[PDB]
Amino acid sequence: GETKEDIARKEQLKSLLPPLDNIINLYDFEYLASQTLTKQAWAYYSSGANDEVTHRENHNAYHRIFFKPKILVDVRKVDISTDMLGSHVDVPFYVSATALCKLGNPLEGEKDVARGCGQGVTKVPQMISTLASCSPEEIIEAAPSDKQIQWYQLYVNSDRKITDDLVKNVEKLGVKALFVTVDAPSLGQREKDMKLKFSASRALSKFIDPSLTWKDIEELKKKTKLPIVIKGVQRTEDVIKAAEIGVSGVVLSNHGGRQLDFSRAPIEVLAETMPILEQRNLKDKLEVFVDGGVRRGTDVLKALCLGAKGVGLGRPFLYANSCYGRNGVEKAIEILRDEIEMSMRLLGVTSIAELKPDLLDLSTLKARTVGVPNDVLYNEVYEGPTLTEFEDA
Amino acid sequence: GETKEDIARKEQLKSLLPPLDNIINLYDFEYLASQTLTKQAWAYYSSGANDEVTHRENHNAYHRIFFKPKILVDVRKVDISTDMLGSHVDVPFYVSATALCKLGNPLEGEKDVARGCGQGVTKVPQMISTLASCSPEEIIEAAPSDKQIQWYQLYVNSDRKITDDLVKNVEKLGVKALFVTVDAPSLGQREKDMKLKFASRALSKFIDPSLTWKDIEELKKKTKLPIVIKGVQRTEDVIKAAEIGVSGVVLSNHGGRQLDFSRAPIEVLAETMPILEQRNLKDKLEVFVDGGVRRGTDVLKALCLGAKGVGLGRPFLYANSCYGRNGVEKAIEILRDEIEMSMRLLGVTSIAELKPDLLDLSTLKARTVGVPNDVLYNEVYEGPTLTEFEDA
Amino acid sequence: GETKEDIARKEQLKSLLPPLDNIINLYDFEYLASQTLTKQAWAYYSSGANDEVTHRENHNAYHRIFFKPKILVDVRKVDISTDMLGSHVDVPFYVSATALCKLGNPLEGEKDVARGCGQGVTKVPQMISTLASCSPEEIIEAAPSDKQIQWYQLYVNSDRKITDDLVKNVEKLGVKALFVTVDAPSLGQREKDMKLKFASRALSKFIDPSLTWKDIEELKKKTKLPIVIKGVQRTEDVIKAAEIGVSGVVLSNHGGRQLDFSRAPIEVLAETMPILEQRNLKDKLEVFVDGGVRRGTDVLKALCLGAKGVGLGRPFLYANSCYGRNGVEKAIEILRDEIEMSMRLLGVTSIAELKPDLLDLSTLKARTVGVPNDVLYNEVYEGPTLTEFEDA
Amino acid sequence: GETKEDIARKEQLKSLLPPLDNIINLYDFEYLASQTLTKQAWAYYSSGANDEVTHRENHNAYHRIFFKPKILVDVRKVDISTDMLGSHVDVPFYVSATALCKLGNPLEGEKDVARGCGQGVTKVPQMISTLASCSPEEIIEAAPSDKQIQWYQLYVNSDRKITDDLVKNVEKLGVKALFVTVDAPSLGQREKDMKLKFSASRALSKFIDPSLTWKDIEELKKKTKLPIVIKGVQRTEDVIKAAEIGVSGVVLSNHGGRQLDFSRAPIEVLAETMPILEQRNLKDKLEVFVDGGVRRGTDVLKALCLGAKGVGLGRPFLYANSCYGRNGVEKAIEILRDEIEMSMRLLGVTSIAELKPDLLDLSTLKARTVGVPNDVLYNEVYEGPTLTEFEDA
Numbered sequence A, D: 001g002e003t004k005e006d007i008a009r010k011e012q013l014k015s016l017l018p019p020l021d022n023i024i025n026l027y028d029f030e031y032l033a034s035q036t037l038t039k040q041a042w043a044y045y046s047s048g049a050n051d052e053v054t055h056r057e058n059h060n061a062y063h064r065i066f067f068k069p070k071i072l073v074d075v076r077k078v079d080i081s082t083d084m085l086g087s088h089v090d091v092p093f094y095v096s097a098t099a100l101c102k103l104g105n106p107l108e109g110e111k112d113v114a115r116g117c118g119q120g121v122t123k124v125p126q127m128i129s130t131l132a133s134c135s136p137e138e139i140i141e142a143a144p145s146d147k148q149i150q151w152y153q154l155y156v157n158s159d160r161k162i163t164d165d166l167v168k169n170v171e172k173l174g175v176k177a178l179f180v181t182v183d184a185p186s187l188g189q190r191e192k193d194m195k196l197k198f199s200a201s202r203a204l205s206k207f208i209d210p211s212l213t214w215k216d217i218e219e220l221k222k223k224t225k226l227p228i229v230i231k232g233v234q235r236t237e238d239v240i241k242a243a244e245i246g247v248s249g250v251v252l253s254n255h256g257g258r259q260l261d262f263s264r265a266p267i268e269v270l271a272e273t274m275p276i277l278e279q280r281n282l283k284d285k286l287e288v289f290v291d292g293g294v295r296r297g298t299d300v301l302k303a304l305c306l307g308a309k310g311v312g313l314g315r316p317f318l319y320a321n322s323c324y325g326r327n328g329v330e331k332a333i334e335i336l337r338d339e340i341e342m343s344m345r346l347l348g349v350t351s352i353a354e355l356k357p358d359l360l361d362l363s364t365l366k367a368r369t370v371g372v373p374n375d376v377l378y379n380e381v382y383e384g385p386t387l388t389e390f391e392d393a
Numbered sequence B, C: 001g002e003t004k005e006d007i008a009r010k011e012q013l014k015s016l017l018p019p020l021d022n023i024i025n026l027y028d029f030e031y032l033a034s035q036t037l038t039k040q041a042w043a044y045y046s047s048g049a050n051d052e053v054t055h056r057e058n059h060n061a062y063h064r065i066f067f068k069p070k071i072l073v074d075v076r077k078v079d080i081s082t083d084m085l086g087s088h089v090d091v092p093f094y095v096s097a098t099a100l101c102k103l104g105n106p107l108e109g110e111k112d113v114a115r116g117c118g119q120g121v122t123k124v125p126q127m128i129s130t131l132a133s134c135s136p137e138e139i140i141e142a143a144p145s146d147k148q149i150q151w152y153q154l155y156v157n158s159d160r161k162i163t164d165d166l167v168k169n170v171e172k173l174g175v176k177a178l179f180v181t182v183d184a185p186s187l188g189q190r191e192k193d194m195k196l197k198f199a200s201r202a203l204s205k206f207i208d209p210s211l212t213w214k215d216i217e218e219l220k221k222k223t224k225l226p227i228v229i230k231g232v233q234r235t236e237d238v239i240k241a242a243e244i245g246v247s248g249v250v251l252s253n254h255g256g257r258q259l260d261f262s263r264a265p266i267e268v269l270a271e272t273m274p275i276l277e278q279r280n281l282k283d284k285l286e287v288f289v290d291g292g293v294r295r296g297t298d299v300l301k302a303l304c305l306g307a308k309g310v311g312l313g314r315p316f317l318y319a320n321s322c323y324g325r326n327g328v329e330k331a332i333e334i335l336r337d338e339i340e341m342s343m344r345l346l347g348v349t350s351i352a353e354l355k356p357d358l359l360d361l362s363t364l365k366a367r368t369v370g371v372p373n374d375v376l377y378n379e380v381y382e383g384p385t386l387t388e389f390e391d392a
């Protein structure tokens, strides 16, 4: 597993971690994390399914979208607060569920992302994983603010009793909503992870029931008063099905590219979906969230302009928590918050409600390309232009 | 040819081959093979025609297709079995014909891919090349299961007697079908191959460059075995095949080893099936595709577009070369699981349910060639940097 | 900040600067500058907002446009002079406002770009920044030719008195126009800049984030100088500008230093001019563009799409920093010749003849984002190799 | 200029030149040439205008075109001969004019490309440059076969007398056609070249008259009986003008990307042009040639399928001539000849006349793209999948 030279090196790098407020963007936590986490943790956290195409595409598709900002608009004041699943929130984003947080943060785990989401002036919703390291009660008890909200992400067990009880329990504990994950009926093949464990129905586990169906969701809807959100939808047809059975929302997601490879970028699915919901006379019947590859405030703004109620982030927070703990999570939150406010100003709007599609240039949303392979001989032999040089010393 | 240093190094690497069950995907057999095979074998197996554009494009075109998976579907059970050329098969894929397998596996050659296809719980169809190292007899005799099926890939000889006899022979031996290759009337230029050995020359009397449709029509009369035209590259020829009544075609370009700039078979498949329907030829033909298939999801996409089966060449060749029969069996297991695992996440439970509504085909045509790089602008530009650790 | 090793190295490189007439293109000044400026100056000048996507896109979008040149046309004589904001100018381009020029040129700052714009045979308009290092007076006083024109770029202060006075002042001083910048109500995040120094903070009372159209309408009444709204990024705002009657706009995003993912001004220009015509606003406004312009052909494309003038920021900044006033003059000569030389090959003889039929705009919209690289497939693949020389 | 270490090194590499028949493709001559030619020659030959975008695009646009080959066709026999400007030729390609051939081949210059074009079984047309190193008569006299044809490329001089006489002269000498170049009224800026000479109307030279117009061509048409071809056309409007004044043809060209940068790939201009010539009832009134970036037989086949009468090549032959002389040129010719025949067989046709557009897939001819710039931080921090490794020795 983790060698002595591995351990020795990382321990030394951890003492050279730069001061938390020298961290400029979310990628910085990722770099530091990639150098300090154990092989196992890094592998667990950073991997995606198979070739990890979807994992990267989730992020790159945001780049097929450009802005059409308004100028000469009074932008002295800006408000990025909004509402999600019935609760008022300070920001348009949230921490999505990430199992085994103790892998990167052994002592605090999820309790630290909870403190991170409520200890600062900006209280951010935290989605709690079913497969979390810590227990539900300790995670919820660690929340430092009564104003902060927490959501419980649920995997339905083959043993429904366990699930029914867990729901009664988290509801008693005070979570504001249930996100039931449906994109993992089977475990995705994360190969970086698999290589380390060298130091078909095997992907199924009764812990997560591969037989979950819409009927099952309809019944769950009857057993609880908590808003229900179907997490992991990847096509418009299922957003419509969700709206028709009456759940509160869906999160357009592919599990951060950790499940089906070649699932589309949720931002693209979002673009296709909202207009169709209007055509089907389902506008606003559902609250639609997206996650995957979101790393910049402008990523969030694009999602909001296309109609997302909220934008989730997984890995960035995981890395912040692992390298700097609760304070890292708070920092991450501050960085994202500011990127959103500053770009909203430049966009020329002053509130989340004003983020609409006419602010986006969607004309090239479909330019997802695959180039003809490189003419290696032609390019190898070719010699490009060179810059002028300084005089010989 | 193969030097002493070459031999010394490779022999040592072969003893460091990792344990067969540490092999995660098809690319792993390729990497190992590339470091252990002889220059000649590697060059022979890994090369494509001219600039090898099509060889790579065959694979890359699969990436112009995305999935539109169904969720909240009972995927506890999944079945990837199907039927090809009248026979029931455990999987939707097969081993395509690859001549000279003894180059990578000197002792067993094709006999080892045969054992690999039937020695495990999953019996996979094996297409036997005309130019195989081993004899038809010994390759078919090597098959360990009576349930496994074998197909014979045929090159029509200028000497038709030789061909007529070979057909009677393989038919007597029990092969379930005849795949007659039509994309190699002349040998493509594999330059990696040629460098090592340092236009009427591309024609050999072995493969008759004069083969025409009439010839196929007559072959149809001389045998009872289903006939499949291997190497179709345009819709017009799929239609001609359906019209002369053969059993199927395999949309292929010889793994990019023949005409460079032939399109990705997956693309030709996407264009073809709808046209077959319009021409009232739906299901008259069984359509297979090969070329650049390396992941289960590649296979699923082909199946959703209507392919009856998906063939793989090189991947199996590499497995056979590095790990022999067990390698082939391993490759088979890897592909089998990739297909089942992703079929579940796709939200379907059988090959029949794999249809085009499961695919996002909106960008199938985004095969691009970028404007050349502005080298001075990019060279001088300095991109953003990541934060750094404190100075030790 | 700037270390001893830094200083020692750069001072030595500055004495090895090549002779000014060995400088072939604008990129050469950029390379030299990047090796000689202080970390602070380089970071300040070369940075863009966040990921710097727009900064680069501003330049790259010019490459989505190709030429459809006329041949067999008498191009013995060529004229690239034109008119901007009521004044005749020798060239179709200008020096856009760049604050803190003393960072790269401590002794002369902006006074040196002024001398550069008028000391040669080609007099180029110079836009003077509000945040310049030098004072308005001294920059205008430094102008060596009475024929050269200067424009004042203005940031409206929260304290309008300061602004009203500054306007009376620059107007008295003789500037030919007022460019009021509207794309920086808040300061963009230049991260290269920030690393060296190791959301209401992005607002300074210097640049009033509350500026609106009404404010511009009133400014129009307090001055006789033509007014140009600098920093327009969408067609709706070009139309609003035309409707309130200002003299023009400059399609710009602050050289990618403000909102990341704002589009390439050239693209916004292509979309805008035809719409202005449809709205019966043809010629009511003079439209300028800036951002990523580095070659004469970039300028020609902007002109063919209807731009009245094309501005350049960084290129001139780099020339001024490395070679001072003479560098600016050199840059001016380089761009001047690139424009004339390519206008001849384009087959036209004057700025007026630069129209869109000279451009191929069919792929203007091919701004793409590729599917991520299949790393295993590409890593394992071995491309063709070139023949080699005999073994020595 | 050329240093002692430069000279010493190159002289040694020239003795290590591999045997001529070990040369597999045109790129091989380019590599060898790039290592053996003098700085000056290489710079002169390999450079294009400004950023050299068009130079590379000329070649890459061929890659936006794919084949739709016919199978089950008797392809035992194949014929790649055709006719150009009234003469029967063994191949569908030719050597385009390249000034100063003595730069790469000091002793023989153009005389060697002439011997190379006629000494073998395949006689290839040779276009002779006005700015050639050798004299017209010696170049024409060096032709070893009476069956081989030569064309004279003309630059019209400000002093028309000189031009009128030169035409009378080359016509007396026996050239079969006049290609008058019109894409160089002014000299393009080849910067690799300029850098070496450190070891506005300055681009004009009365030697090449910048005032040439259509009228001038009409009159030239009256002063000679040789077919005239306007070399350097870059838009459809001028192909139509040429057809209307009655010249024999045009060569869709941009001077190998050595003149206007951002001129289009001639193959693309060809695709657009031929259909328009038919619509305008001008089909076959003109013979249309293309040049630029052609390096493979399939490049040639694509051009022919789109209606080109012949395909020219510049640099490849220049490099072959420079490194191996007359025999190199002959080799180059053999390589191209075979690539064309072998791929024609696989295409499923047996003669040049059968090369038509239904053999091409033109659906993506317009996918000439410019990607959104790279998200450097995201890609830098990302860590891709790795291949399995051999056991530790």
Ligand SMILES: Cc1cc2nc3c(=O)[nH]c(=O)nc-3n(C[C@H](O)[C@H](O)[C@H](O)COP(=O)(O)O)c2cc1C
Pocket: A044, A045, A046, A058, A096, A097, A098, A099, A129, A130, A131, A132, A153, A181, A231, A253, A254, A255, A256, A257, A258, A291, A292, A293, A294, A312, A313, A314, A315, A316
């Ligand atoms: C290490 C890791 C563990 C995760 N565990 C869960 C989980 O237990 N339940 C769940 O619903 N989603 C899980 N997710 C998915 C996230 O909730 C979310 O979809 C994803 O992280 C968003 O992508 P991003 O990481 O690119 O922002 C996990 C993601 C990661 C990276």
Ligand SMILES: Cc1cc2nc3c(=O)[nH]c(=O)nc-3n(C[C@H](O)[C@H](O)[C@H](O)COP(=O)(O)O)c2cc1C
Pocket: B044, B045, B046, B058, B096, B097, B098, B099, B129, B130, B131, B132, B153, B181, B230, B252, B253, B254, B255, B256, B257, B290, B291, B292, B293, B311, B312, B313, B314, B315
């Ligand atoms: C080394 C090698 C030898 C081959 N020999 C034959 C052959 O004799 N007959 C035939 O029909 N196809 C032959 N093929 C082509 C395959 O049947 C198949 O079309 C191709 O390998 C599919 O491409 P892939 O390798 O990317 O999967 C050969 C391919 C390779 C790589």
Ligand SMILES: Cc1cc2nc3c(=O)[nH]c(=O)nc-3n(C[C@H](O)[C@H](O)[C@H](O)COP(=O)(O)O)c2cc1C
Pocket: C044, C045, C046, C058, C096, C097, C098, C099, C129, C130, C131, C132, C153, C181, C230, C252, C253, C254, C255, C256, C257, C290, C291, C292, C293, C311, C312, C313, C314, C315
């Ligand atoms: C270092 C620097 C300082 C600038 N300062 C100003 C300013 O004070 N006012 C303004 O209107 N624009 C300012 N700009 C933007 C320029 O006027 C112009 O829009 C931009 O430089 C054009 O982009 P380019 O550098 O790629 O040519 C500045 C640009 C740079 C690079």
Ligand SMILES: Cc1cc2nc3c(=O)[nH]c(=O)nc-3n(C[C@H](O)[C@H](O)[C@H](O)COP(=O)(O)O)c2cc1C
Pocket: D044, D045, D046, D058, D096, D097, D098, D099, D129, D130, D131, D132, D153, D181, D231, D253, D254, D255, D256, D257, D258, D291, D292, D293, D294, D312, D313, D314, D315, D316
């Ligand atoms: C070094 C060099 C010199 C050239 N000289 C001439 C010339 O004197 N006259 C002319 O009409 N074309 C000239 N050309 C252009 C060629 O005739 C032809 O257009 C070009 O080489 C085709 O591009 P390619 O080199 O990529 O094949 C020259 C090209 C090169 C590379």
